[PDB]
Amino acid sequence: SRLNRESVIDAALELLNETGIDGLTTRKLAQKLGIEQPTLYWHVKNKRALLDALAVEILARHHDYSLPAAGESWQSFLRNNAMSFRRALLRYRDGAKVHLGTRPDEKQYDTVETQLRFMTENGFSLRDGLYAISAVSHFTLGAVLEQQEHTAALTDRENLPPLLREALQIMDSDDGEQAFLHGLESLIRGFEVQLTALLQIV
Amino acid sequence: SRLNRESVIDAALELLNETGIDGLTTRKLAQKLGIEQPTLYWHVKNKRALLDALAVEILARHHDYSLPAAGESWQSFLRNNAMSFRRALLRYRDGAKVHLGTRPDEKQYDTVETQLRFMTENGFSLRDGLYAISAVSHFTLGAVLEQQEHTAALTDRENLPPLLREALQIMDSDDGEQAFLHGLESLIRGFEVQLTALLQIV
Numbered sequence: 046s047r048l049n050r051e052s053v054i055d056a057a058l059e060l061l062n063e064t065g066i067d068g069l070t071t072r073k074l075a076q077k078l079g080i081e082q083p084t085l086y087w088h089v090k091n092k093r094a095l096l097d098a099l100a101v102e103i104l105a106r107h108h109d110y111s112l113p114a115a116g117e118s119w120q121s122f123l124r125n126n127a128m129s130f131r132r133a134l135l136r137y138r139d140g141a142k143v144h145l146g147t148r149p150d151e152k153q154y155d156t157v158e159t160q161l162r163f164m165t166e167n168g169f170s171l172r173d174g175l176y177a178i179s180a181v182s183h184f185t186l187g188a189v190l191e192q193q194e195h196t197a198a199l200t201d202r203e204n205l206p207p208l209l210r211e212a213l214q215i216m217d218s219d220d221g222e223q224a225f226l227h228g229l230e231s232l233i234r235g236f237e238v239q240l241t242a243l244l245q246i247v
Numbered sequence: 248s249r250l251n252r253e254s255v256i257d258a259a260l261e262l263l264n265e266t267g268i269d270g271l272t273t274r275k276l277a278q279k280l281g282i283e284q285p286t287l288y289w290h291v292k293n294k295r296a297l298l299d300a301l302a303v304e305i306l307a308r309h310h311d312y313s314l315p316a317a318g319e320s321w322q323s324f325l326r327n328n329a330m331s332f333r334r335a336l337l338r339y340r341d342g343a344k345v346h347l348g349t350r351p352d353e354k355q356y357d358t359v360e361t362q363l364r365f366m367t368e369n370g371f372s373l374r375d376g377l378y379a380i381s382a383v384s385h386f387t388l389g390a391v392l393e394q395q396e397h398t399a400a401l402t403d404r405e406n407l408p409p410l411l412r413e414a415l416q417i418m419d420s421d422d423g424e425q426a427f428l429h430g431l432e433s434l435i436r437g438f439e440v441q442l443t444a445l446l447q448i449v
């Protein structure tokens with residue numbers, strides 16, 4: 046097959062979706078691509094390189110709300126950005142796992158700079174703006190992680206107390222979206238309390 | 248070596264700390280234990296079983312704030328519980344990854360029931376209490392994930408714009424704890440706004 050950047054990543058995304066993060070071995074990638082391993086090594090040195098590139102491409106493909114609308118409130122931007130990030134992370138098997146620990150790629154610099162600048166323009170110190178964005182990112186990654194990994198575990202592997210029993214029905218009543226959106230509102234409002242408080246005790 | 252539950256888990260925890268979640272293969276576990284693979288299979292059927300058991304034991308060992316103090320506020324319980332959960336997840340390499348997607352084990356039923364009951368006693372519906380606890384869990388897992396995976400990536404693998412440059416210094420100025428604690432306060436306060444609002448628009 047074609048071994049340009051785009052096609053290697055396509056194939057790796059396919060292989061990820063088919064077999065998860067453990068299936069992504071340079072060995073199985075060579076098979077999908079129809080090549081020998083030294084051929085693949087010329088293009089792709091190791092799993093880390095591959096994963097870093099997949100993380101960027103997952104957002105290029107499916108992260109459709111990466112910048113604020115004109116005059117958009119910071120609350121609304123974080124909300125829309127979070128839902129977009131969640132969507133993108135859920136579109137491939139183990140995609141959140143792929144994203145973990147990545148730092149912004151050079152291709153993403155202008156976008157992440159604008160996000161950070163936008164927060165400071167709305168009254169946050171750089172630090173407080175970053176802690177908000179971070180918290181949103183972290184909560185969204187955890188929520189997605191937990192969902193994706195739960196589904197995996199249900200393909201592999203009775204005296205419940207009553208509240209737990211009900212709580213289990215509730216979590217499993219949708220894909221996680223209800224709990225995620227409730228949490229996201231809580232988070233955004235907590236940032237707001239913090240921001241508006243200025244130097245007052247809060 | 249001894250192949251009781253306790254010693255198998257000890258060994259697997261050791262192997263996890265030494266080699267991360269990918270190092271935990273039934274094959275490498277058999278070597279640490281000084282046994283052949285069919286011997287190990289009698290005790291441990293597959294990786295999933297192992298991981299589920301490790302997740303429970305990581306909390307038994309290092310999760311020291313799993314229940315509310317007498318008269319403790321719900322805010323203070325969530326705070327103390329979250330910091331405890333974070334500590335426990337950070338005590339082994341890839342321990343958050345080990346915990347992902349696990350549901351409460353029978354050994355943990357009484358504790359999780361009490362957590363859920365405690366929330367409802369403090370004015371939450373079961374559902375809203377669960378969304379709070381979930382959000383805390385998810386945010387803590389993401390935060391820990393991101394930290395642990397970042398450190399891994401720094402063992403494997405220059406025109407930064409200014410805000411990103413500073414933001415990178417800030418994240419890397421500690422182990423993640425500052426951002427985590429700031430986020431946690433934001434989250435808890437957002438739950439409070441939601442709870443006290445009752446049927447009022449908020």
Ligand SMILES: Cc1c2c(c(O)c3c(O)cccc13)C(=O)[C@]1(O)C(=O)C(C(N)=O)=C(O)[C@@H](N(C)C)[C@@H]1C2
Nearest residue numbers: 111126130147148149153156157178181182414415
């Ligand atoms: C600001 C920032 C971000 C991210 C990030 O990893 C990061 C970092 O590692 C160090 C310092 C700053 C940041 C994101 O992953 C990312 O997901 C991202 O790259 C990103 C994106 N590229 O559009 C986002 O939308 C952000 N959003 C999920 C809060 C977030 C922004």
Ligand SMILES: Cc1c2c(c(O)c3c(O)cccc13)C(=O)[C@]1(O)C(=O)C(C(N)=O)=C(O)[C@@H](N(C)C)[C@@H]1C2
Nearest residue numbers: 212213313328332349350351355358359380383384
């Ligand atoms: C309530 C609950 C919890 C957890 C959980 O996985 C869960 C679930 O999967 C379905 C329904 C309810 C819950 C936790 O993982 C756990 O980490 C947990 O087992 C736990 C523990 N065993 O002590 C905790 O302390 C909790 N805390 C991190 C918010 C949280 C509580």
Ligand SMILES: [Cl-]
Nearest residue numbers: 046047048052
């Ligand atoms: Cl071709």
Ligand SMILES: [Cl-]
Nearest residue numbers: 046047048049
């Ligand atoms: Cl080619």
Ligand SMILES: [Cl-]
Nearest residue numbers: 248249250254
């Ligand atoms: Cl022995």
Ligand SMILES: [Cl-]
Nearest residue numbers: 248249250251
């Ligand atoms: Cl034995």
